[PDB]
Subunit: 340 residues, 3 copies
């Protein structure tokens, strides 16, 4: 809820407070979700300030404090900055902006990502055009420039990023996406591509110079029915591992699915049903491994706009068998969740 | 300040600004406080949303950014999360909530924590049940389901928390507290007990399958006079070191008292007097030591609901010839502090 | 924006969202600024309770989150608290604070510190009196005790400060500043000094017992016309490297000049001309070398008070022979800034 609003400005402070606990055989260290205390928080700020009838200045910055760390050594673990950027909206010319934000592929993935906690597997962090990424930028368009209603696209070039490290960096890119909601129904596509950096293709798991995430989906957000599914392949991006040869970096080829359905019940029950299989094909000396397979089952409960709590659980589809090592065990998290 | 209060979910964004500096002898390291700059700040938010008549939902977070650090290598010593939790309160059934909050036995330990900077020595953090600790479920209740004004309770489970460090872990616990307030007068005590996990156990100092901390407090609040002292012992919970042999871990046995007399003047002076004795028994090969011995003189002065400042002072009863080597040296704090 | 206000207490929640990019020849390592993504944000707060007519308590804080980071290894990088302090004002007795705050000398440097992005090259941090230190005790006075208009002074005692980084330390100082602004024009000096900690004497570079930076500046800020120029030197003060030999520490002797002039057109463009020359003297064996040289050209384009953006261009007057290693290159900066 917006908490300053003078002068044709409005700074919205927003955040949450999540008591989360995971549950899985032992430390889980090898079920799909893990296990133990998983409690975090959110504190960020949406700002906007039209500089007049058609133009809009704005920025936003959402950080992440973790609630599970001691008050010593490691109090800084998994503290990050999720989003941060500047922008301008200008009539039906459209919008633009730059800083760390959601690659554009996300535009797709989004549809299937709403489990109460888990799901959203396809889309990693810093995976190039599919996650939240460091300096990228975007143009978004508003019903073909206002000409025809509901169909907005965008497009995005993704800056040089030779960070520390393997699964973190990324050479360059264009990328975009076109998209269309028809009262209730809705259909989306998105694709992108970019240089990898030599730290990359010099990893042991990796044959590419240039890779592509593309991805699509049909959703039906209406009347408390939500139906959404995605299919989406990749090329030299999903990042993988081999706790066995313990080696790392990237999976040449992969296919992706996601299914999800939720019904938003009458007093705020809103259980949820979900599917989801990410196979890598052609892993060097592995043939084919499922980086992730599960049905899901669970629900959020909406005390209102501010509170909820949920129970969410993952019936796990890989098994011990599994070529690279994705832990096999189910994991079920329960958590509670205030938010202003 | 409460900065946002709406559709029945208020949010109070809160903190301070704390110009602090210790003075100890020559160099302090062999004092009980430190020496030089201590300055720090405080950001955090409680919010509570009214689901409705007898259902309030609230959350809360509180971080703390040290101010004494440089803007390079280190500007990170000290920041931590202090607090993140979440939950609900039901007219007369009690509460509940979960995350990183206080273990029960502070309900009692607290009373004696009221010195303007020091005092409150027995409540380490991540000490199981006595300081803030992570992953705790905290059921409270009040006036015995509304039945007996002033008579309060609580129970709580303490998570399996395998961090890396010895001094910072904790197998699992229950524990709680009973408390009763009568026209100035406060009676409390509480008690808990949890496994150590093997890594705790495998410390040179440290003998037991089982830790238990407990404690009690009797006090007088009211009429511009604070009167309160505290007593409690420990089973294998109180962390200690041996700077001589750089030996680390815990103390089979301790016994502690806290003693505060304080008084709030018509013009916003409020001096504050203090004892603080924490003896260890059975530290392997040392036998008995005093972890903490002091009287503390010092006072606070309250420009108003927003400002304050003060000078707190510890008269060290430890001495040089102390078997673990607790610092013998008097230490003297001087604080000024805004705070919304 | 000020978000809160009743009862003497006003608080002011404030920040921005700076989306940045550097452009510098090829790999940026030999430029003045770097090159790539740079997108950071600010979060902070000013607070001030009037405890009466004459007396005022404030506190305030300011932290610098970065956005050029993944959300993994490094999420923590180049992040600080810059400012944290508090204290009291008094009709014309004056004023006072402790915490981490700007040093006296800045008060003159603060006049040339204006480039949309670069400039102010002389005010390192954690450099004794020239930028932000931590543990400083500042006294300010207004309109010479209300007596004399625009004449204000201020002495600052500067903390024992022995950190890790050689070049983040400092023994103790005092210092100040008379500042005199007369209808249109502004003319001010500051100086101070103090000891160096030993890890400081120790570096191969810099011969000193005792440091001192002074500086003055002059300006005409009035009418959509800003010119300032600054000049000043330092004893065993400005922090310098020898990328060749890789050695560290301090420039025996340095000399420093700042030249800015910008103009404020009334649809809101406001172009800036910039120049800056810093030169070490007597650097142990390297003797006379160049610490920063360039002419700068760029402009800021306000949308309103709350938005804006700018480009800043460093035309770099160093060259490749440069005894110390100073990159010789130009850099350019695009920026889009929102701020509330």
């Amino acid at each position: 809820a917006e908490i300053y609003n003078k002068d044709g400005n409005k700074v919205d402070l927003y955040g949450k407070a999540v008591g989360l606990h995971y549950f899985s055989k032992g430390n889980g260290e090898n079920s799909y979700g893990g296990n133990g205390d998983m409690t975090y928080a959110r504190l960020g700020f949406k700002g906007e300030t039209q500089i007049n009838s058609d133009l809009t200045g704005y920025g936003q910055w959402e950080y992440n404090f973790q609630g599970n760390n001691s008050e010593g050594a490691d109090a800084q673990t998994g503290n990050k900055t999720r989003l941060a950027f500047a922008g301008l909206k200008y009539a039906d010319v459209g919008s633009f902006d730059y800083g760390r934000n959601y690659g554009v592929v996300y535009d797709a993935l989004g549809y299937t990502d709403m489990l109460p906690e888990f799901g959203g597997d396809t889309a990693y962090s810093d995976d190039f055009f599919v996650g939240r990424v460091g300096g990228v930028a975007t143009y978004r368009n508003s019903n073909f420039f206002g000409l025809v209603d509901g169909l907005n696209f965008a497009v995005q070039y993704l800056g040089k990023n030779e960070r520390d490290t393997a699964r973190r960096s990324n050479g360059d890119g264009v990328g975009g996406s076109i998209s269309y909601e028809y009262e209730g129904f809705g259909i989306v596509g998105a694709y992108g591509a970019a240089d990898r950096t030599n730290l990359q293709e010099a990893q042991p798991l990796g044959n590419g110079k240039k890779a592509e995430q593309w991805a699509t989906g049909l959703k039906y957000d209406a009347n408390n029915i939500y139906l959404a599914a995605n299919y989406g392949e990749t090329r030299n991006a999903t990042p993988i591992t081999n706790k066995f040869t313990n080696t790392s970096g990237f999976a040449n080829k992969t296919q992706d699915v996601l299914l999800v359905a939720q019904y938003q019940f009458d007093f705020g029950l809103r259980p949820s049903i979900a599917y989801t299989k990410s196979k890598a094909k052609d892993v060097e000396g592995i043939g084919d491994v499922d980086l992730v397979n599960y049905f899901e089952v669970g629900a959020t409960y909406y005390f209102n706009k501010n509170m909820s709590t949920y129970v969410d659980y993952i019936i796990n589809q890989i098994d011990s068998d599994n070529k690279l090592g994705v832990g096999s065990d189910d994991t079920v998290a329960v958590g509670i969740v205030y938010q202003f």
